[PDB]
């Protein structure tokens, strides 16, 4: 069955972009999916998206450009300690310079750069570049 819903949305995306696709319909969506789709959006890795309202759990249409090499999800959502964030981005990001680790902290779902600036930390959601 389902343990997580994010992992499906992310994968669906990745296969869309790999095909050469410019849109996807993910299902079923969640506040966390929105928040993650949103961080991606702010940065350029996707275009605009749209939450369609079935009387159920939702369905999202993402319009994607093609700046996206990969958006992954980290499971389980490990706790990170401010100097485990430095260790994570190195593990899974292309160059020190770019790509984001996106985690969930007490003060919001955020990319790790925003994390560093706020100076808060938490549990790791996923990534992209």
């Amino acid at each position: 069955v389902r343990m997580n819903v994010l992992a499906d949305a992310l994968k669906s995306i990745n296969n869309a972009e790999k095909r050469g696709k410019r849109q996807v319909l993910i299902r079923p969506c969640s506040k966390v999916i929105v928040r993650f789709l949103t961080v991606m959006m702010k940065h350029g890795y996707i275009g605009e998206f749209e939450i369609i309202d079935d009387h159920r759990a939702g369905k999202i249409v993402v319009n994607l450009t093609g700046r996206l090499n990969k958006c992954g999800v980290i499971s389980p959502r490990f706790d990170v300690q401010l100097k485990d964030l430095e260790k994570w981005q190195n593990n899974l990001l292309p160059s020190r310079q770019f790509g984001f680790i996106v985690l969930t902290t007490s003060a919001g779902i955020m990319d790790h750069e925003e994390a560093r600036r706020k100076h808060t930390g938490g549990k790791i959601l996923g990534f992209f570049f």
């Binding site: 095909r19 050469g20 696709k21 410019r22 849109q23 996807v24 319909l25 749209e50 369609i52 309202d53 079935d54 009387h55 159920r56 369905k59 249409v61």
Partner: protein, 84 residues
Amino acid sequence: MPLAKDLLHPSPEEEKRKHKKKRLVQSPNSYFMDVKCPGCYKITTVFSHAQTVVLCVGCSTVLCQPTGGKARLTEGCSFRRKQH
């Protein structure tokens, strides 16, 4: 799958061909009707697929028998849908 559809606005025709659960936003593919039988003049509302015998208001009549799917309406009968 040629990198071309508007997943958000898909066509009504190919939306209408797809499984009820596969529809963009879901919805059913079943309906209701009003049914006649001259002898009476009033009209019983009936569900397109039905399982139950449906009998009319008074006359022990009939008014379809069930099946795998849509109820088979019985011989000399008439039916407007229908609403919204």
